[PDB]
Amino acid sequence: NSNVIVCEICKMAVKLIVPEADKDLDQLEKEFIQGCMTLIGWLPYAEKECKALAKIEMGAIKTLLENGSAPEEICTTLHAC
Amino acid sequence: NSNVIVCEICKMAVKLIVPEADKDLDQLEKEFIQGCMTLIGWLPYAEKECKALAKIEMGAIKTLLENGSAPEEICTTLHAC
């Protein structure tokens, strides 16, 4: 819909994932969830949003990178940023 | 936490509630939920957030008005806007 902070959430995950030689869930999630909370902790079901976005966003970002997407176009592909 | 769109959500509910001679749930909710979605429909549990915020935000706004809060300070009181 609006997307204005899903896009900041996505830009945040891209920073988390891209520089990492060893891409994997390995507690890159924890870092994602904290920065996700910081951006949406003030919602009644914030924790639940962030748990799900961690898998959805980071999974999507990782595969798009593997299949040749330019890192600065990934959030546009996903969310029209 | 961040609050940047809970504050737009609150400013939106204030517009919905304040001019209304007959303050009540009466499908002022529907209107709230649509404008809430527009602001957060792109989240995995958006509908759930909006259902809850409708009761939390509008209930809080209505009582604060009844007890003498200035309408332009209500979202500051609630969310530090």
Numbering used by the authors:
A (entry chain A), B (entry chain A): 7 to 87
Lines quoted from the article behind this entry:
The fold is comprised of a four- or five-helix bundle, where a kink in the third helix can lead to occurrence of two helices, α3 and α4. Three conserved dithioether bonds link helix α1 with the C-terminal end, helices α1 and α5, and helices α2 and α3.
Ac-SLP-1 exists exclusively as a dimer with an experimentally determined molecular mass of 19700 g/mol (MALS; theoretical M = 19062 g/mol). Ac-SLP-1, despite being a monomer in the asymmetric unit, crystallised as a P2-symmetric dimer that is aligned with one of the crystallographic axes. Near the N-terminal region, a citrate molecule was found to occupy a special position on a two-fold axis. In contrast to the human hookworm SLP-1, Ac-SLP-1 does not possess a prominent cluster of basic surface residues, but rather three small isolated basic surface areas, comprised of Lys-17/Lys-21 (α1), Lys-36 (α2) and Lys-54/Lys-57 (α3). Ac-SLP-1, in contrast, shows no such feature and has a well ordered internal side chain packing. The trigger event that leads to disassembly of the membrane-associated dimers may come from the tryptophan residue at position 48, which sits in the link area between helices α2 and α3.
